[PDB]
Paper text:
Mitochondrial energy conversion requires an electron transport chain (ETC) that generates a proton motive force across the inner mitochondrial membrane to drive the essential adenosine triphosphate (ATP) formation by F1Fo-ATP synthase. The ETC consists of four multisubunit membrane complexes: complex I (CI; NADH:ubiquinone (UQ) oxidoreductase), complex II (CII; succinate:UQ oxidoreductase), complex III (CIII; cytochrome bc1) and complex IV (CIV; cytochrome c oxidase). We purified the intact respiratory supercomplex from mitochondria of the ciliate protist Tetrahymena thermophila and determined its structure by single-particle cryo-electron microscopy (cryo-EM). Here we show that a supercomplex containing all four respiratory chain components contributes to membrane curvature induction in ciliates.
Owing to subunit acquisition and extension, complex I associates with a complex IV dimer, generating a wedge-shaped gap that serves as a binding site for complex II. In our structure, COX3a and COX3b extend throughout the CIV membrane region, and COX3b has evolved interactions with CI subunits on the matrix side, thereby mediating the supercomplex assembly. In particular, COX3b forms a contact with a peripheral amphipathic helix of NDUCA1, which is part of a zinc-free γ-carbonic anhydrase (γ-CA) heterotrimer. The γ-CA heterotrimer was previously reported in viridiplantae and ciliates (both diaphoretickes)8,19 and our structure demonstrates that it acts as a structural scaffold within the supercomplex architecture. The second major interaction site at the CI–CIV interface, which is on the lumenal side of the membrane, also involves a fragmented protein subunit, this time from CI. Consistent with the observation with respect to the protein splitting in CIV, we modelled the N-terminal extension of the ND5 fragment (ND5a), as well as the newly identified protein subunit NDUTT16 (from CI). NDUTT16 engages in interactions with at least four subunits of CIV, as well as an interfacial CIV haem group.
Numbering used by the authors:
A (entry chain BH): 90 to 178
B (entry chain BX): 18 to 57
C (entry chain BM): 8 to 68
D (entry chain AF): 259 to 360
E (entry chain AM): 1 to 231
F (entry chain AK): 28 to 257
G (entry chain BI): 24 to 172
H (entry chain AF): 53 to 206
């Protein structure tokens, strides 16, 4: 959107090329994610797998914001614009 | 697979218990045991 | 008091895992005689190990 | 210094040799300080020289994109994947910086 | 309304569980602050009677239940029923019902399958004077009164044993089969052997009565030695 | 004297100086059951009551979403005549009936073992095979994949169809929710210690140790995934 | 089922008659003899027998469209590294035949020296004719930091 | 074998105290100490943002270390130095001071890479009496060192 | 095809779907229609379901 | 001064006031929660120890045993001689009849011994082996007898010394098993005669199990403090590094562990002489360097 | 009228076939009752969370998007 | 065996490695004939070391 | 009325009461309060210490005990002497931070940044053209954290 606002059609073209190539670069790993059985990747402590509630909670907050960032993005944009407005450029 | 319960209580299943009869005497030492449920 | 229906309200097992330096002279309150003896020994030992460092630091300060 | 697409292979090697926690801290430091100051060089600090920076940035971005378009699909390591994710995002932010300084 | 009653029961149960959780956590934290190691001790968590929510085992106080055994879920024992040492009546998916004067041997395992065809009960039902040997396995089987099952015998789903039938030890009853009354069956796949005699029937009756008496003596001795909880 | 006490000294999980059992998530080990030695248990594996698993003489591998049954004894052998590893290997979705005994063997995925079976050392049961309840697999015998065997010694009966294989897999998957229902009945904190009486040893230790590390370090942040955890 | 010749009432065959013997020259110049089975990869057999000299960073590769399928699917990604190389003796190497292009790519990209008889254990599928096959297993390279863990 | 959780917590505590200082900060917008450092709203906000993100990452790292300890105390001492000295870059008022600050931060990062754990106690019992060569440590050090050299000279 | 008759109109159908064979568990035959659009089990209105067995045993125990 | 004094005062105050208060509140809350949850809940219990159970004057005599599993059941007239082992889940109901177990006799997991008669005794000889899931009713088992996994010995059976019963074998009631003979099947029948190699491997297996019983006894018979120490040691080893392990071995050997002691290193690493070879090492038949036997290659 | 425990009742007078049939019918009826009770408890476990947390969820969504 | 990980003890002695691992002839020689070498035996390892050099 | 008295032990709480969310004032903007000493040296800043700074130090001392214990709770394999020494070091660091905050508060009072007890003769009053927080603060708890002319 900012590139369009600045009227950079060539920059938009190159951004899109890079974006789509990188998109497939990330997506192809979903093919490898498929596994014949369920993996065992947890460390064992006291003879049982160690699952960290704190890291799970942090991942859950990150997941919530990842899913619903669009809803609250206006506040973050306001804050970032407020921070940048101090720069006199 | 299916996990529903066969024995319903809303009504009694129609059945005939005389078509198949279970043997209960005159067995041999090589014959298999009879069947318990023989309703059709 | 001592016992309730099933739970022993005075249940207690002492923790046998204690630090070795517990009850050492140095761990006594600062300014006490035992603490002063331990600290004096520690200071003498440190000075003997590093005469030059103790000079350059304490004398300079 | 940063390890942007024209000079990226050493960054791939560093990521291969680093632990996951080291990468966790290094990516934060890199993006939040090094790359941000690199962007501010053209935006805020050395803004009066943008009449020269624009062409250099454009050439670097084009060369990097055309150099990685094929390499990013040749890796076979988790560390390489993380490093090239960082590199791709760096190129995208460089394009955005060009747009900003316009 | 029954639904409202069930909802209230679930709510109060959850509140009680949360209260227990907070109390135990507070006790552990107090131990940590007090340098007390009592909480840390590992002790067997085995519960002889384990109740699934709404499925509580029920048994007459006259019954002898071995402290080594484990009754789980919907289990129902009779007047003087005896459960051997190490035997488990899981009865979690469906119910397990036992008669007045039955004997279950040591290491006997009873567990019922998830579902069966129409007209076949999916619960284990055992007669009044049944005698089941040690090491037997039972699954969703019906056993009538005065039945003796030999040691190390496997009885599968839908299998019905009529009154007075005898099964020799080290034999298996295939699923969905009938063992008529007053007959002896033996072999890994059970095969007809003969018809029981009055002497054999009397011997089996005396054997089960002796087992009941031995169970009573075991109960008394364990209560004396504090190995049996005075329910 | 040696064996005179009122409270049992039994622990479900035990090790022999280097052999720590490992259990995955959602895996229920009954308090009656004993799992001692070098035993590895996968995810969603259920071991019912009064079952013994000794990996002391050799390693034992248990797959995911398997059922071990009741009164079942799994143990290893020192070695095999063929020179193969003598560890016990059990694949995923394997159901083992009650009263059965497993020696050093190789059970592949989706295998169903009947109640009271006896699999002897060196046996290799392939994927999808079934065994009758009271049958014996002699040592060093190969049971082909997707086949039915019965008797002592075991003898071939017929091939198994995709419907039978699907039914076995469904049963293996179905045991999981029963295991979780059993699991939910235990709170993460054991309350048995609250029922004991203080002793002289408890009130005054004979000897003291140096504080190195508490086994439950970071447990205020670890999740109580398995209630039956020390 | 299938691939067996049993009739109702037959006894099971011995595992001894079915095990396929693989002879190996270890990285330290000694000789080893291990057993494998048809239908499993040489990498699986070697890891089961705990043969030293193989790192197997990728641990067999992908779980779908694997290189072990007799008709190799063209959409396969091939091996994900070259840390399972084994030198196979010519009598069995010729029977194995020409290399897949992805396997050859990984082998040539290997950091350590390679031989014309080199092959990837994960890409090899055990067959009956491989009985008594002789191979050599020099030390394979370590790819990333996680190999030390 | 001391767990570095206390070092990480100390770093978090002092970062929080620095955040408190920034929140209570007051003054005029100008340069200080011979015009080598700039003190204005945007620079201070950049400093605060860097500190906040470092604090959050340190919190996650503390949780991970409690999970498992494969990192020494020197590792987190290097992290402490990096966190302390890296936000000062945005306060730079001249390219000279920026170069020196980035050089110091580069030395700290090189310290962090040096203190990476090398040998693990894994379950592989096959290499007890054989030499296994791993070049990752040298590769990291070599490339980091030479990249720093080129960037610094230029 | 002539023998095939999953329903019991022409060839009588056992309530127990199949006859179990020795050395196999007793499982229901797969239905011809395997639709899973099934409600929870339905019971008659005002169906009595109190745990009479448990109540009687508890009353006897007192 | 002030800082450390405040620290010590707070430590004492916490340990003496907050600990007991939180403990009391937690116990009361736990009781209240359990009362609320009843009758649809169960609480933890002190599991009784069923080893050495006395019934009507019948007192087990098992003190002269190497290993008795904590969760096994030994009731009534059960006599065991020196070195005998009873493993997990084994049930020996001796009130039905006397149960005699000989020296170094191994009874593995889930093995039940129960006399089918009213007072018939079960006698087991020395160096006998009974495998897991076995079931002995009432029989005379002589010394050095072997019983396989999942094997049933019926009432009135008499198996002589060096008689082998294959695993999964059901011995018919009132059966005699001669010496040095293998019986297998169900019903069990004579199969062949034990070979010297088979006898050797059986003896080695029995000895291995006897030795393993000692390790099992050592592990099971531990105090709560010792078990806690084991848990702490395992947790510490989970994070110990190569340097820490080397230091552990060095301190066990006796190397200096302090800087001031580093100056006497030679007295602990090099000065100590090496133990001279045993004279049996000079009588070896051959001294050729060892090489793998290439038979079958 | 009054509850009778057929399993614990005296069935010696009846023939074995009649005895087993009565036991089977009694078992089926009791199993149906148990099925009804457990289904009701499951339904209650469904209803409770809905009533308790439906409005909070709507409140959260309403605040987020409005 | 206490303190030796997966290494386990046999009837006639204790092994020098984990169960399924391969025995090492050089380690065997070092243990049995420590410090004694009648002659410099040229094993495959020695020959390969010479070739590599 | 909106700020605590600068001479009280709670006069250090005025650091959290700010008129605008800016860090620093512009070069030329008048400080909110009369300037006492613009060119303040170290000795005079120390001489300007006050009960407010002493209260800040006391707050730091009080809050450094829970924080020091929180830091210490992540310590393992430590002797009692080292644990006590680490607690002392952390507590001293927190108290030193309190001293630094008190010094900054004294500097701010000298420069007029925070309430120093004086008021400009003629207030420079703004026009609250943009107002997204007046009603929110009046109806909320945050009216205490903001200073309005
Ligand atoms: C649209 C895109 C949006 C993208 C967003 C990206 C980020 C999203 C994910 C992260 C967001 C932050 C999450 C909270 C911090 C993480 C730790 C935590 O709190 O959980 C542990 C803790 C878990 O407790 P526990 O499980 O009982 O015990 C844990 C341990 O056993 C025992 O615990 P312990 O004793 O070890 O530690 C106790 C301590 C542990 O917590 C910590 O120590 C905090 C660690 C994070 C420090 C940095 C926070 C920065 C916050 C400001 C915004 C930037 C966020 C950047 C986040 C990513 C940075 C990489 O707990 C606390 O005190 C929690 C306080 C958290 C609030 C701190 C606010 C600081 C504000 C400073 C700046 C103020 C303005 C200055 C203006 C100046 C102007 C001149 O959390 C809780 O107790 C509550 C958890 C459930 C509610 C969480 C609510 C989160 C709300 C987030 C709001 C984000 C801003 C608003 C939205 C913006 C977009 C619209
Ligand atoms: C000029 C060339 C450079 C050299 C100059 C001299 C520098 C001397 C510094 C202090 C040296 C302490 C002794 C070191 C011994 C080392 C050898 C040794 O013992 O080996 C064995 C030793 C182990 O044995 P140990 O028994 O465990 O420890 C040794 C001692 O027992 C326990 O050791 P500790 O460190 O834990 O205890 C230290 C304690 C030793 O214990 C005692 O003596 C008892 C406690 C005495 C406390 C005295 C406090 C006095 C405070 C006065 C404040 C006045 C303010 C007035 C304000 C105005 C009022 C109107 O002494 C102190 O507390 C010294 C504090 C002195 C502060 C003086 C402030 C002067 C301000 C001047 C400017 C004023 C401007 C405004 C004026 C306005 C006027 C109107 O080895 C070690 O591991 C020691 C490591 C020591 C590290 C020290 C350095 C830490 C900081 C490193 C920074 C790195 C760079 C990053 C920062 C960049 C800038 C630096
Ligand atoms: C009208 C009259 C009004 C009079 C008011 C007088 C009172 C004025 C002071 C009020 C202080 C209110 C509480 C402040 C925060 C207390 C934090 C604490 O004790 O936590 C300990 C805790 C320690 O943990 P813990 O004690 O909670 O327990 C830990 C337990 N485990 C470990 C098991 C989980 O501190 C932390 O965890 C913080 C770690 C990160 C560091 C954060 C530093 C924050 C510094 C804040 C300084 C004070 C700011 C005051 C702002 C006032 C604005 C108006
Ligand atoms: C990226 C790296 C980090 C960030 C960048 C690094 C910045 C580097 C530049 C910093 C410059 C700081 C200069 C401050 C100079 C003024 C100092 C001051 O306030 O003095 C006021 C006072 C004077 O105050 P005054 O200025 O008011 O006095 C004059 C007053 N009139 C004019 C009215 C007469 O200074 C002194 O009296 C002392 C001067 C210094 C004496 C020597 C001190 C040496 C200390 C050595 C280290 C000791 C460590 C001890 C450790 C103990 C515990 C282990
Ligand atoms: S395991 Fe990586 S290529 Fe074979």
């Amino acid at each position: 959107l900012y590139s369009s606002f600045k009227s950079q059609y060539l920059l938009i073209l190159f951004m899109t090329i890079l974006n789509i190539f990188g998109m497939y670069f990330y997506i192809q790993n979903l093919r490898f994610v498929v596994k014949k059985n369920k993996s065992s990747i947890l460390n064992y402590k006291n003879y049982y797998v160690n699952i960290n509630y704190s890291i799970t909670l942090n991942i859950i907050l990150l997941n919530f914001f990842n899913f619903f960032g669009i809803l609250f993005l206006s506040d973050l944009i306001i804050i970032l614009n407020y921070i940048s407005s101090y720069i006199y450029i | 697979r299916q996990n529903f319960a066969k024995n319903i209580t809303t009504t009694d299943i129609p059945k005939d218990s005389h078509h198949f009869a279970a043997k209960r005497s005159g067995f041999t030492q090589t014959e298999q045991a009879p069947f318990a449920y023989n309703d059709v | 008091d001592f016992f309730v229906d099933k739970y022993n309200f005075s249940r207690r097992v002492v923790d046998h895992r204690q630090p070795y330096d517990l009850n050492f002279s140095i761990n006594n309150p600062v300014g006490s005689r035992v603490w002063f003896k331990a600290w004096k020994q520690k200071a003498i030992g440190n000075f003997l190990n590093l005469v030059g460092v103790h000079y350059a630091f304490y004398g300079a300060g | 210094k940063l390890g942007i697409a024209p000079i990226q292979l050493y960054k791939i090697e560093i990521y291969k040799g680093l632990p996951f926690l080291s990468i966790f801290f290094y990516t934060t430091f890199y993006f939040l300080i090094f790359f941000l100051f690199f962007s501010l060089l053209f935006i805020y600090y050395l803004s009066a020289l943008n009449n020269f920076f624009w062409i250099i940035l454009l050439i670097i971005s084009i060369i990097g994109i055309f150099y990685i378009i094929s390499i990013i699909f040749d890796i076979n390591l988790f560390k390489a994947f993380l490093a090239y994710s960082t590199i791709i995002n760096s190129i995208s932010f460089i394009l955005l910086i060009i747009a900003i300084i316009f | 309304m029954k639904l409202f009653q069930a909802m209230w029961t679930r709510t109060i149960y959850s509140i009680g569980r949360m209260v227990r959780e907070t109390g135990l956590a507070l006790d552990r934290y107090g131990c940590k602050l007090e340098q007390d190691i009592s909480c840390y001790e590992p002790l067997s968590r085995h519960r002889n009677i384990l109740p699934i929510y709404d499925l509580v085992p029920t048994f007459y106080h006259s019954t002898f239940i071995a402290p080594n055994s484990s009754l789980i879920g919907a289990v129902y024992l009779g007047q003087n029923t005896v459960v051997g040492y190490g035997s488990t009546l899981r009865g979690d998916n469906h119910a397990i019902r036992v008669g007045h004067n039955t004997v279950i041997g040591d290491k006997v395992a009873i567990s019922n399958v998830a579902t069966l065809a129409a007209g076949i009960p999916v619960s284990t039902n055992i007669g009044n004077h049944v005698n089941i040997g040690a090491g037997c396995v039972l699954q969703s089987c019906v056993v009538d009164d005065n039945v003796t099952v030999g040691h190390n015998t496997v009885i599968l789903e839908g299998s019905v044993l009529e009154r007075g039938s005898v099964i020799a030890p080290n034999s298996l009853v295939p699923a969905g089969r009938l063992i008529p009354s007053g007959q002896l069956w033996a072999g890994s796949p059970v095969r007809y052997v003969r018809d029981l005699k009055e002497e054999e029937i009397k011997l089996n009756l005396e054997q089960t009565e002796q087992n009941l008496s031995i169970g009573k003596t075991h109960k008394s001795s364990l209560i004396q030695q504090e190995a049996y909880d005075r329910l | 004297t040696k064996y005179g006490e009122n409270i049992s000294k039994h622990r479900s999980l035990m090790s022999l100086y280097d052999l720590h059992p490992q259990i995955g998530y959602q895996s229920y080990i009954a308090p009656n059951s004993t799992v001692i030695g070098e035993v590895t248990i996968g995810n969603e594996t259920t071991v019912w009551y009064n079952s013994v698993i000794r990996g002391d003489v050799n390693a034992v591998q248990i797959g995911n979403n398997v059922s071990i049954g009741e009164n079942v004894v799994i143990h290893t052998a020192g070695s095999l005549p063929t020179g193969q590893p003598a560890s016990v290997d059990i694949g995923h979705y394997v159901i083992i009936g009650s009263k059965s005994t497993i020696y050093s063997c190789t059970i592949q995925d989706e295998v169903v073992i009947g109640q009271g079976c006896v699999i002897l050392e060196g046996a290799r049961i392939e994927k999808g095979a079934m065994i009758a309840a009271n049958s014996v697999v002699p040592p060093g015998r190969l049971i082909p994949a997707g086949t039915l065997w019965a008797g002592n010694p075991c003898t071939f009966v017929r091939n198994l169809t995709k419907s039978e294989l699907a039914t076995n897999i469904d049963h293996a998957k179905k045991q999981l929710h029963l295991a979780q229902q059993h699991r939910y009945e235990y709170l993460p904190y054991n309350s048995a210690y609250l029922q004991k009486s203080n002793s002289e040893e408890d009130l005054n230790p004979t000897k003291y140790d140096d504080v190195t590390i508490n086994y439950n370090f970071g447990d205020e942040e670890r999740a109580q995934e398995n209630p039956l955890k020390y | 089922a299938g691939n067996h010749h049993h009739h109702a009432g037959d006894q099971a065959d011995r595992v001894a008659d079915k095990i396929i013997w693989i002879n190996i020259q270890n990285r330290i110049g000694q000789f080893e003899r291990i057993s494998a089975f048809e239908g499993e990869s040489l990498l699986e057999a070697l890891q089961r027998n705990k043969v030293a000299g193989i790192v197997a960073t990728c641990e067999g590769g992908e779980d779908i469209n694997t290189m072990l399928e007799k008709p190799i699917d063209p959409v396969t990604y091939g091996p994900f590294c070259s840390s399972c190389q084994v030198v196979v003796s010519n009598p069995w190497r010729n029977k194995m035949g020409n290399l897949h292009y992805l396997e050859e790519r990984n082998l040539v990209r290997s950091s350590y020296p390679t031989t014309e008889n080199s092959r990837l254990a994960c890409c090899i599928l055990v067959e009956k004719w491989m009985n008594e096959m002789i191979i050599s297993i020099p030390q394979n390279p370590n790819s990333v930091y996680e190999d030390n863990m | 074998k001391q767990n570095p959780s206390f070092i990480i917590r100390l770093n978090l505590l002092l970062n929080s105290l620095m955040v408190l200082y920034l929140i209570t900060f007051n003054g005029y917008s100008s340069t200080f100490w011979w015009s080598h450092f700039k003190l204005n709203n945007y620079s201070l906000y950049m400093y605060l943002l860097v500190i906040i993100f470092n604090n959050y990452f340190l919190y996650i790292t503390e949780k991970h270390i409690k999970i498992l300890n494969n990192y020494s105390i020197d590792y987190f001492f290097s992290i402490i130095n990096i966190t302390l000295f890296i936000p000062m870059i945005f306060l730079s008022n001249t390219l000279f001071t920026f170069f020196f600050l980035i050089e110091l931060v580069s030395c700290a990062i090189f310290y962090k890479f040096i203190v990476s754990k090398i040998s693990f106690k894994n379950s592989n019992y096959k290499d007890n009496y054989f030499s296994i060569f791993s070049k990752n440590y040298l590769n990291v050090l070599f490339y980091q060192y030479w990249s720093s050299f080129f960037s610094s000279v230029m | 095809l002539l023998k095939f008759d999953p329903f019991g109109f022409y060839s009588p159908k056992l309530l127990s779907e199949n006859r179990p064979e020795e050395a196999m568990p007793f499982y229901e035959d797969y239905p011809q229609n395997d639709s899973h659009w099934n409600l929870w089990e339905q019971f008659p209105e005002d169906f009595e379901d109190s745990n009479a067995e448990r109540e009687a045993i508890l009353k006897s125990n007192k | 001064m002030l800082r450390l004094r405040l620290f010590d005062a707070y430590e004492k105050i916490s340990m003496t006031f907050l600990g007991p208060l939180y403990r009391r509140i937690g116990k009361s809350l736990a009781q209240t929660g359990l009362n609320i949850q009843q009758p649809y809940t169960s609480d933890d219990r002190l599991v009784p120890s069923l080893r050495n159970i006395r019934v009507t004057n019948k007192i087990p005599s098992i003190n002269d045993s190497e290993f008795i599993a904590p969760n096994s059941v030994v009731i009534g007239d059960v006599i065991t001689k020196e070195g005998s082992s009873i493993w997990y889940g084994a049930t020996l109901r001796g009130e039905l009849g006397p149960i005699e177990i000989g020296k170094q006799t191994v009874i593995q997991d889930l093995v039940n011994i129960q006399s089918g008669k009213q007072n018939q005794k079960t006698q087991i000889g020395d160096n006998v082996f009974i495998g897991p899931n076995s079931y002995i009713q009432s029989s005379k088992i002589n010394d050095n007898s072997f019983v396989g996994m999942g094997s049933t010995v019926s009432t009135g059976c008499n198996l002589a010394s060096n008689a082998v019963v294959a695993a999964g074998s059901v011995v018919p009631e009132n059966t005699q098993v001669p010496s040095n003979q293998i019986w297998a099947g169900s019903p069990a029948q004579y199969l062949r005669d034990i070979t010297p190699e088979e006898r050797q491997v059986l003896q080695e297996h029995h000895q291995e199990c006897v030795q393993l019983a000692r390790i099992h006894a050592e592990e099971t018979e531990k105090s709560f403090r010792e078990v806690l120490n084991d848990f702490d040691r395992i947790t510490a080893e989970a994070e110990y590094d190569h340097e820490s392990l080397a230091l552990q071995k060095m301190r066990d050997l006796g190397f200096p562990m302090e800087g001031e002691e580093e100056e006497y290193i030679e007295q602990r690493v090099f000065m100590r002489e090496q133990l001279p070879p045993l004279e049996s090492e000079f009588w070896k038949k051959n001294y050729d360097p060892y090489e793998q036997d290439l038979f079958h290659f | 009228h009054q509850f009778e425990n057929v399993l614990l009742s005296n069935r010696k007078n009846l023939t074995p076939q009649e005895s087993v049939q009565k036991v089977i019918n009694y078992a089926l009826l009791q199993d149906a009752k148990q099925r009804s009770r457990t289904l009701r408890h499951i339904k209650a476990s469904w209803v409770i969370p809905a009533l308790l947390f439906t409005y909070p969820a709507w409140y959260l969504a309403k605040g987020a998007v409005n | 065996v206490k303190g030796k990980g997966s290494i386990r003890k046999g009837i006639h002695g204790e092994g020098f490695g984990a169960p399924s691992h391969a025995h090492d002839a050089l380690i065997h020689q070092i243990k049995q004939s420590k410090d004694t070498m009648d002659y410099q035996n040229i094993t495959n390892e020695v020959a390969q070391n010479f070739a590599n050099h | 009325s909106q700020t605590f008295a600068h001479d009280s032990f709670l006069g250090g709480l005025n650091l959290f009461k700010r008129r605008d969310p800016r860090f620093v004032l512009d070069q030329g903007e008048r400080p909110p309060y009369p300037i006492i000493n613009s060119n303040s040296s170290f000795v005079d800043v120390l001489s300007n210490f006050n009960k407010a700074d002493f209260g800040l130090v006391l707050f730091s001392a009080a809050i450094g005990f829970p924080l020091s214990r929180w830091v210490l709770k992540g310590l393992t394999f430590s002797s009692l002497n080292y644990r006590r020494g680490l607690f002392s070091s952390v507590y001293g660091g927190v108290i030193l931070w309190g001293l630094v905050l008190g010094f900054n508060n004294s500097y701010y009072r000298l420069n007029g940044f925070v309430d120093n007890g004086l008021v400009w003769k003629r207030k420079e009053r703004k026009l609250n053209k943009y107002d997204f927080t007046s009603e929110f603060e009046d109806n909320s708890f945050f009216k205490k954290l903001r200073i309005r002319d």
